Design a binder for these strands. Structure first.
Lengths: 76, 204, 86, 78
RNA sequence: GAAGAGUUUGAUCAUGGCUCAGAUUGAACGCUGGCGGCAGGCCUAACACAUGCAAGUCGAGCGGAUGAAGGGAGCUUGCUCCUGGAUUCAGCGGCAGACGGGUGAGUAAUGCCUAGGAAUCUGCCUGGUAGUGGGGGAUAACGUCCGGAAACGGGCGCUAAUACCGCAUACGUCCUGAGGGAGAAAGUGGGGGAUCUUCGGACCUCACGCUAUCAGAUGAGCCUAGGUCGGAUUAGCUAGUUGGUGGGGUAAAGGCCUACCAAGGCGACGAUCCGUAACUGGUCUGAGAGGAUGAUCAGUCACACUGGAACUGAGACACGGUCCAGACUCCUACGGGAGGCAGCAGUGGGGAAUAUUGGACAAUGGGCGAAAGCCUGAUCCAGCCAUGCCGCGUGUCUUUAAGUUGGGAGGAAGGGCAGUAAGUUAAUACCUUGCUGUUUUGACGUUACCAACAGAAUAAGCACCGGCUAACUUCGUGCCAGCAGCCGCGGUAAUACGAAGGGUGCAAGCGUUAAUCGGAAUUACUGGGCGUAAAGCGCGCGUAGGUGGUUCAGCAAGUUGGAUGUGAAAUCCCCGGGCUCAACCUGGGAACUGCAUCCAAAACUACUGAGCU
């Protein structure tokens, strides 16, 4: 219930996209690779700038390609 | 089962095979002194894989078994836990085709395999007619009560102490009914086989 | 071909469609006049016009031509803007 | 529609049942909700007849499932 | 739990490809065939389809059609006026037809699979909560007319209700959530002693129905993350696209639809375009890693001549529905009509190649029904085919199979009935129902299976034999004719080619054509290479990225352990139980290396901070 990513684009109101990165293993190659995942997060008040770190929550979808809202700015 | 004339199969091996036709001898009139085939007045190059063949192609020619049936019996040796060679000849001695003669109701396996199909050898008060039943340690072995005055059953009771006792059964000759006591190890067998060398004819 | 078990419901469907087309249109003309009432901005007929409509929006919903929460939205959409006329 | 029902496994002229809890939206032998214990009317020595467990059989009767016709008079063998 | 040979050379060694042993299939083909049990059988044309059948059910939901009987009146047993009610069933109406069934065309991603998430409906089912009153207008059948050879159309006129529309009525249920407004239903049959009378009705009483809601079960719908095919000789794509609000709309969230505001969105972790293909549990070869792969079986998806579209309904954008368009086909008496086998048979036609115009709802289901039951090409089960997978038989004086005869279980749960007891009953009066014991009856495959009888009468074939396969004379033929997987063989004593003459492989099958993996370390993560065999760009600057000296502290993303839900069932792996045995069948578990959540850990990595040289 906690997904964390760094802010990469904020030029739209009430909506922000982050890179929820991870590092997981390749199945037949063994080397742990990074796999970037670019979610969309909904902001209620639009207070997130590029380079911020946030956590998010799942609910009913807020738009097309958006089903995750803003919980809290963890750090900056 | 293999059929036909059988004096010509006693010649390749050198052993008596327990394949005969009467009650006095074997390979004593059917001229066993050579190595048959197409042309066999000369020998040469008698070595491993063709000997591993002549091992299994002897064991096939004794026990009434086909390679449909016999290389499925190597399949249970790996299904067996450990000691695959003697555990092959376990099911050839839990075989009913051999143990009618290992008791001695028939003259050979060629009369043992035959009469059990002709509704002679029951197992435990039921009606079994297969030459492949797997006798457990501790059933009776009886004969159906219409082949008792079959007198070629009485033409097999003369070779009990003449082909030697097996020392693994306890039989009643008056009833013509026996009892398989327990399974053998590799001390109760004839010494003409190589049990973990039939195994080696599996990968090549 | 087709069966008279289905040929009977050939009449049983399109005739039933004709009754369900009118009663469905008897709903949405009452809602149009209480949107014409808001678009005329006259509360003095708008209050009397959708209280004629609410006994029709759910009476059709009660008999299974439409669903009962389609009524529940349109009873909450029209009231939320008649209140805005103030 | 929810129903406890005899369902043919086994071989031809060798019936074996599962007593599936099904939906009556599916086939007899596919997409069961639950298998409670089995049945075997060719039962001979060593084979148990029916593995009916009343721990779960109460629940579908409690949640509203029904015997078909025969399933009522297998519970009558108790 | 892992076996390699042969072949480059005069010989060697190394790099490196070829061909070979094996096991397999939905099998063909060439051969020759005795039987049983379980199986499986258009892989090609999602090609066209004659013919029959694949979902009709209900009269105890309603009007209306037809008259079993029986008791009588006349004529005198021929007949009808009646009296009656047995019965059927085309027209309305409920429900089902959205299931079972089939096929894999489309789809490269929201389809499938694994995990999770909430903003929803669900007829019949199951628990309650409240309720079935009073009316009104039509409408088919039916009557006739018109058009038509028929099929069918469409003009008025009749009548019904468990068909429809108001009115009454509101425990929830909806709106406003202040107050208030709003909107439901249908009756039928088995009965019943007291009062109203035509104790037909009324009221009483259960049974099936009916309604307004809640909780659940059962389905079904959204949303997110993950992965899911080949290409850069496809690098830019995108405008309703990405957000924002107003509204509009879906059972339900949502640019889904909409207007206007802004310029965002996707993509080198491979976008978009292009070719390809249902997916998965799984399957096949494998020491495993894997690789190949989706026939029977089961889940989900998808389609119904082709395309668009809604309608009705709880549920469809509906395979044996309607509408429109297209292609095709068919009947015409030229007026007008009809059809959609990827449903079971079956037919062409294609192809290497694949079955019967079967028997019955007796079992299991369903679909209607108060119940009886009524239908089902789903199913149970049969012909056809060595197509596998097992067993079995063709004799060493037995008679198994097969065949003759006599026997002989198990598949049946119950239904009828007429007592017997029960508990709802206002009245165990009475119906209706569950119990009990007896009687009556119903098996598609009609048998498996037991026990007699005549007699070896009814049963073997195939391929090879130069090597590394320890099966290995000659006769005919003469660099001819030919065989063969790799070498090669044949150019005149031929173990290599054609017979005979013998053996051998394993057997009702044996072989070779084809495809898959293997050995193949021959795409090397496990587990390979690059001075000269193939292979270092001619070298730099450096973007993403891969990896990153050093110390304490912190974080807990990777890492590590346990916890819990699963990872469906099947398949497999062991122990079993059964078919007389084996397949096959199941019971039990094992297995399912996976997924997220949860807490615990801090050596190392990332990240965070102060540093150290």
């Amino acid at each position: 219930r906690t997904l964390t990513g760094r802010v990469v684009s904020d030029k739209m109101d009430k909506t922000v996209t982050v890179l929820i990165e991870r590092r997981v293993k390749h199945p037949i190659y063994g080397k742990y690779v990074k796999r970037s995942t670019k979610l969309h997060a909904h902001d209620e008040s639009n207070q997130c700038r590029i380079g911020d770190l946030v956590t998010i929550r799942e609910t009913r979808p807020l738009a097309k390609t958006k089903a995750w809202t803003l919980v809290d700015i963890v750090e900056r | 089962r293999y059929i036909g004339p059988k004096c010509k199969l006693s010649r390749r091996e050198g052993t008596d095979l327990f394949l005969k036709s009467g009650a006095r001898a074997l390979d004593s009139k059917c001229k066993a002194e050579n190595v048959p085939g197409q042309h066999g007045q000369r020998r040469g190059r008698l070595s491993d894989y063709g000997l591993q063949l002549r091992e299994k192609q002897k064991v096939r020619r004794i026990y009434g078994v086909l390679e449909r049936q016999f290389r499925g019996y190597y399949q249970e040796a790996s299904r067996r836990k450990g000691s695959t060679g003697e555990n092959l000849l376990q099911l050839l001695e839990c075989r009913l085709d051999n143990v009618v003669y290992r008791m001695g109701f028939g003259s050979t396996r060629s009369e043992s395999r035959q009469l059990v199909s002709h509704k002679a050898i029951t197992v435990n008060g039921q009606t079994v007619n297969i030459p492949s039943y797997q006798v457990k340690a501790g059933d009776v072995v009886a004969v159906r009560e219409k082949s008792k005055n079959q007198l070629r059953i009485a033409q097999a009771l003369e070779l009990c102490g003449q082909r030697g006792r097996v020392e693994w059964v306890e039989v009643d000759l008056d009833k013509k009914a026996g009892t398989f006591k327990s399974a053998p190890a590799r001390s109760d067998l004839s010494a003409d086989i190589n049990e973990n060398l039939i195994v080696e004819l599996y990968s090549k | 071909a087709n069966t008279p078990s289905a040929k009977k419901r050939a009449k049983q469907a399109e005739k039933r469609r004709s009754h369900n087309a009118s009663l469905r249109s008897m709903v949405r003309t009452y809602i149009k006049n209480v949107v014409k009432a808001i678009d005329a901005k006259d509360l003095e007929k708008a209050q009397a016009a959708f209280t004629a409509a609410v006994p029709v929006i759910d009476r059709m919903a009660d008999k299974g031509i439409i669903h009962k929460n389609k009524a529940a939205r349109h009873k909450s959409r029209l009231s939320g803007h008649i209140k805005a006329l103030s | 529609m929810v129903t406890i029902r005899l369902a043919r496994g086994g071989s031809k002229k060798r019936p074996f049942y599962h007593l599936t809890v099904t939906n009556s939206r599916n086939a007899r032998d596919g997409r069961f909700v639950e298998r409670i214990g089995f049945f075997n009317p060719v039962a001979t020595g060593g084979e148990v007849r029916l593995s009916v467990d009343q721990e779960r059989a109460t629940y579908w009767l409690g949640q509203g499932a029904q015997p078909s016709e025969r399933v009522a008079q297998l519970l009558k063998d108790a």
